[PDB]
Amino acid sequence: WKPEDNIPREILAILSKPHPNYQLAFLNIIQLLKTSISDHMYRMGLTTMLITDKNVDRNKCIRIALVHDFAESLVKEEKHRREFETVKYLCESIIRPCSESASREILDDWLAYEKQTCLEGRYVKDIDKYEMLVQCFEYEQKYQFLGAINDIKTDEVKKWTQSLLEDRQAFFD
Amino acid sequence: WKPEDNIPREILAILSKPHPNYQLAFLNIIQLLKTQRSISDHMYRMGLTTMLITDKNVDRNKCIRIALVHDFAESLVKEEKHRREFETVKYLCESIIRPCSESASREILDDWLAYEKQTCLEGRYVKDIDKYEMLVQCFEYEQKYNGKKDLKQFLGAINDIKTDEVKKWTQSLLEDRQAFFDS
Ligand SMILES: [Zn+2]
Ligand SMILES: [Zn+2]
């Protein structure tokens, strides 16, 4: 495989020339965030700000909730590896040139989500799930949840889902 | 006028309710921000753009937050228009953010204030980037043609940028656009 087979032809052309415009190349690879996971990650980022837990840097939480689904855009056993190498490629062939801190921190936050070596990654995955719960509920509000209270880690988002389920039982009747 | 006018009823029902689900209501308010002048997508591309700041003297966390909130007063939208957005941010904070995270309320209010009215370096950077990506938009559009172009959005860009770093980005971009038109 090759982690450029999905990078468009002309962005590849932009980066290959010596000392390219890595910023426009980024704002182009991102101006592709609409296929719409851009809204998804943005909404999750805004949601992270509501964590009561004192043991939280919600800034890293936003970082995680802004970069994690942003990997599966290009790209399982082969996946969460080759996704790792495409994140590697974006970090070291786009971000590392014109940004020192960002390449490192971005990769390690992507891992912090894709291995959950941090409480923030756990919160962000909890949110990727609980927002979808909200969406299923607000959908059937015009007319499936699957044990998802078990499928939540943290106690805080567990309580969020508990409130959501109370509202479910209110609605149906 | 008052901000409650520009708010869907379903959410107000979620709110004048005993044990209101403030998180669900916040998620609803966020889920109807998908709309452009999408603005959720605009703020997301902003959020990932601001991470490309290398002015070591900048809190890019506050940058990402200002970016992700600076245009959030937009479900509730002629000097009084900014009055309405200010009262809107305040209404959303005192009545939706305070009742579930008292600190996030004063974080969001002051991040929005740091943007629209400038207060920090992070605000300057986020504003410069809202202009920069619009410039990228216009250039890609102009590229999909032989030119014209659509000068008028470019006349005088390097003067609407306040930071050195984004001035540099914009200089590179204007160079490449002149290269396009030299063909
Ligand atoms: Zn997701
Ligand atoms: Zn903006």
Swiss-Prot record, chain B:
Reaction equation(s) it catalyzes: a 2'-deoxyribonucleoside 5'-phosphate + H2O = a 2'-deoxyribonucleoside + phosphate
Chain positions recorded as a divalent metal cation 2 binding sites: 74
Alphabetized GO MF terms: 5'-deoxynucleotidase activity; GMP 5'-nucleotidase activity; metal ion binding
Location of the HD domain: 39-135
Alphabetic keyword roster: Cobalt, Hydrolase, Magnesium, Manganese, Metal-binding
UniProt keyword Hydrolase present: yes
Subunit structure: Homodimer.
Family from the record: Belongs to the HDDC2 family.
Cross-referenced PANTHER family: 5'-DEOXYNUCLEOTIDASE HDDC2
Protein name: 5'-deoxynucleotidase YGK1
Organism listed in the record: Saccharomyces cerevisiae (strain ATCC 204508 / S288c) (Baker's yeast)
